[PDB]
Each structure stands twice: as structure tokens, then as C-alpha cells.
């Protein structure tokens, strides 16, 4: 993958589905990113991480930020995950539960969206058709941010739009990264 | 067609202003210069509102209304009572506009006694002002961090942009740390003896 | 010699919520932003020639403010 | 819900930040020149970056609403009486340290 620098303002989006069953998705998020790299080739990608691994989902988004934290919606969430909303705080413990612990297959990435509609499509749109094309889900889950470590914002009565994820917003349910 | 393709000459001319005011927020300044009405942070000032002004004419120009992205803007809704009528009065005190809605206890008392009155509660002076204390002291808190909020969402620049918290220089060399404790130390020593001037002075009357 | 606006100052007031103050309240102020930006410009200094330049930085002054206390507490994590 | 307006050439963090700064109280005159009284002052020498002076006035202003802000949140009364250092040195006692 091609680089950009960090800074605060990009896109968090995360590539999966929700050797044996992680063998096939894998096979999908690496196709889709290649054709990324085909469909909009400009360098918009600031901080693919990964690693190590296999790692419960919150540590896979402690080494994606080297400043400040996110900030990701409750819409924006699975739907598996965001189903088991439908209470304060006590969700926070909950949200916890499906974004914590869990192991992930899952690749996330944080990319930059600047100016630049190349052909069509958006880099948002973009990796959405090279992410469909591929046969590969994709949520885009919030914005990066100066504050905070991770920040939930009560999404779940109006979505949020694909293109409003860079706003303010006034989160409840923060949550610390972890350690080193 | 013709006049969307003027739009984004506005567009760009935006993005001009932003060069600029980046490239003058770099220029060192020494006291000279910091006595100068024409100084490098001036010029910057006076660049920042032809930028946010230039930006307003754009927003009337194409329907959009003029604000942009900050916490200050959503109403904060409050029901802190246990009764959703006083909060009907009282949920818009940010009903008024922009910057400088934020109230006194008084205010508070005017909106629970109005929301008590025009309603007609008939609760004693007491829980009535019970209502009118932890609502003041609740939504006062409440307002005081959103503002702060927006503070730590858009400060500085790009130069304190990136800023990583456990890159400071005081970690790895403690000669630093000593100076450091030290300057705190006279700080909050200063605040609280000015503070006092004033107390012990005003005791004059 | 001329200060900074009683007008200005009776604006931070009405900022916080206040409505109107006692007449040396204005000059309190004064002391107070005076105090304040003192001990960061201090602190700042105490960097910059720590770190041997011949010039104070905005990051010189982010990684003074946050060490004020309450006062950037949230910033960058 | 009336319509709103993202600029492409423009990052909105950016805008927000610029419309933040031209929002200041404080006219940029007297407080450039009050940090020129505080360094020559301290008789350091020393340019100063202009983003240092923005930073500087951003966090100053914030520290004094601040301290407003804490006066008023303790003031409990019968009709508004008007504000003396003895409400600040009360707020202060009660809250205290910064903003």
C-alpha cells in the first residue's frame, strides 16, 4: 500500500464481514484493496493497520492512531452489532461486549478524503464499488480526532451521512485505549 | 452552468486565502515586530476574516445557511426535573442565539416560576427552588464542557495539530523536569496571591 | 497610558454568565490574564532554550498550556 | 433543518478553526502588545511564532470565560447583585486551579 500522513480529519473504515472461515474473507479484503489501488489510484490511505494479531478489535484500533483518538457512530456500527441496541451508559457496557473482546479477521484502515473526484467515483466511493466489486463488506465507522481516546456518538435515531462524519458531535461512552 | 463553473474559482480563491494564512502563521515574530499594528499575526488576523467572510457570501450564494460544524449549534436538550413542562421553559435557554446564552441562577428561577406559573404547579417555594438549584448548577456544568469541548476540537493550527502527548521533551531529560516542577510551582503560587489582592483589596469598601 | 477595553471585559464577564460587576473587577481581570500568560510563557521559554532555539514555537506553547492544569486537558489524548 | 455547505477546497476543521479565531474578544493589538510587555519583561529575547501568539490568546480567553463561568456557577440570590473579587475568590475556593 501506498502512505499519506496521519493527521486528524481522515476516515475509519473497516474491512470484513462480522486458515478455516477467516481463510476466505481475508482472500477478499486484499483483492479489494488491490483494486482500490486500480479503480482510484491516488495515495489516500494514512495508517492501514493490522497487527500483530490475531487481536481483540479495540487493541487492532490502538495502533492505527499514533495522535489524538477517534470518533465512530452507533449507525455506522455492524448491524449484527447494531441490532443488539434496540439505556445510557449500560449500552456503553454492551457496545463494549461486541467491540471489545472480540477477535477480529477484520482489516482496518483509515483513509483521506481530498478534493479529487477521479472518474466518478469518490475515495469513499471508490473503495465502496472496488469493496462490492470484490465481494467484500465494508462499514466506515467515524471520523479521526484531536480528543479522546475512542468516542461513541448516540447515532442510532438519525444516521449520520456518509459524507457528514466531520462535525463536532459531543460524544457519551468514552472509552481509554490500552497499553504498551 | 456557466456560473458553477465561477463557483469554484470562489472555491479555490478560499483555498488561496489558506495558503497564506498558513504561510504568515509560520513568520517569527521579535518584539519589534510585536509592537507592529501591520505585524505577520495581524496580517494573518485580517486574512482569517476575509476567509471567514469570503465563506459566508458563498453559503448565501448557494442557499446553505452559513454554519459550520461545532457543538455550540445543536440545541442541548434538558430534562433534569422530574417534570417535562418546566423543562419546556427551561430547554430553550439556548432557543437563544449563538455565543453568550448561558445563564444565572436567576434566569433559572425565572424560566421554573414561568414554566411554575402559566402552567399552574402550586408547589411550595421550597422544592421549587430545589428544581431552579440542581438545574442551574446541572446545566451550567453541562454548557461549561461543551464549550471546552469545542475548545480541544479546534485549537491552534496546523503546528499544534500534530502533537503527540508522550513525545515531551520533560520525560527524557529530568534537568527539564526539575525546571519545570519548579515554574508550576511559582504558577499556581501567583494565581492564588493575585486572586487574594483582589479579595483583600475590595475589602477596602 | 491606555489598557485593554472595559467594554472587552465586561463581554468575558457576560461570557461566563455574568451580567454586570463591581468596578475593579475590570483591573482584576487585567492581573489575572497577565498572571496567567506569564506562567505559560515561562513554561514555553523553559523549552525553547532547553532545547537551544532562538525562537518560542506554538508546539513550546501546547506543551506549556497542557502542563496548566484543567486547562487543555482532553488535547491529543 | 435548512440546508448547510461543505466546501471542497477547504478541510471544515480548518474553517471551524479560522471562524474560532475571528470569534476572539479581545482585539489582537493590545494582546500582541502585552506579550511584548511580558517578554521584555522577562528579558528573554526571543522571536516569537505568530501561531505561538494564536495559541496563547485561544487558551487565555478560554481560561478567563473559564473563571466567569466558575464565579457564576456558584451565585445563588434574591435578584442580580452585581459581581466583586469576592464571588471569584469564593468560586475559586470551592472549584479551583484552571478555568
Known sequence: ?180 | RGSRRQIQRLEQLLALYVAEIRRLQEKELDLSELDDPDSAYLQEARLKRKLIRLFGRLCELKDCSSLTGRVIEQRIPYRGTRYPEVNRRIERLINKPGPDTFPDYGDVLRAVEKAAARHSLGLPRQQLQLMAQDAFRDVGIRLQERRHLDLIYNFGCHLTDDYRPGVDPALSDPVLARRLRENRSLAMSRLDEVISKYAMLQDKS | IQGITKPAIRRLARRGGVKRISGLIYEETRGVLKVFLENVIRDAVTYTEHAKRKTVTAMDVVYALKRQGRTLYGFGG | KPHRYRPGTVALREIRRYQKSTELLIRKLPFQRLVREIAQDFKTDLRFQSAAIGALQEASEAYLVGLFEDTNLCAIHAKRVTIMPKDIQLARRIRGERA
Open chain 1, 1 to 180: 500500500l501506498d502512505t499519506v500522513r496521519y493527521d486528524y480529519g481522515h476516515y475509519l473504515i473497516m474491512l470484513g464481514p462480522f486458515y478455516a472461515e477467516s481463510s476466505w474473507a481475508q482472500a477478499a479484503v486484499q483483492t479489494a484493496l488491490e483494486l482500490f489501488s486500480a479503480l482510484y489510484p491516488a495515495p489516500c490511505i494514512s495508517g492501514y493497520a493490522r497487527p500483530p494479531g490475531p487481536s481483540a478489535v479495540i487493541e487492532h484500533l490502538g495502533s492505527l492512531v499514533p495522535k489524538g483518538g477517534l470518533l465512530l457512530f452507533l449507525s455506522h456500527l455492524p448491524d449484527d452489532v447494531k441490532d443488539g441496541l434496540g439505556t445510557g451508559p449500560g449500552m456503553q457496557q454492551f457496545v463494549s461486549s461486541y467491540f471489545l473482546n472480540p477477535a477480529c479477521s477484520n482489516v482496518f484502515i483509515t483513509v483521506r478524503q481530498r478534493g479529487e473526484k477521479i472518474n466518478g467515483r469518490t475515495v469513499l466511493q471508490a473503495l465502496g464499488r472496488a469493496c462490492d466489486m470484490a465481494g467484500c463488506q465494508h462499514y466506515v465507522l467515524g471520523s479521526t480526532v484531536p480528543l479522546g481516546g475512542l468516542n461513541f456518538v448516540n447515532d442510532l435515531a438519525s444516521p449520520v451521512s456518509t459524507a457528514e462524519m466531520m462535525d463536532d458531535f459531543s460524544p457519551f461512552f468514552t472509552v481509554e485505549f490500552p497499553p504498551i
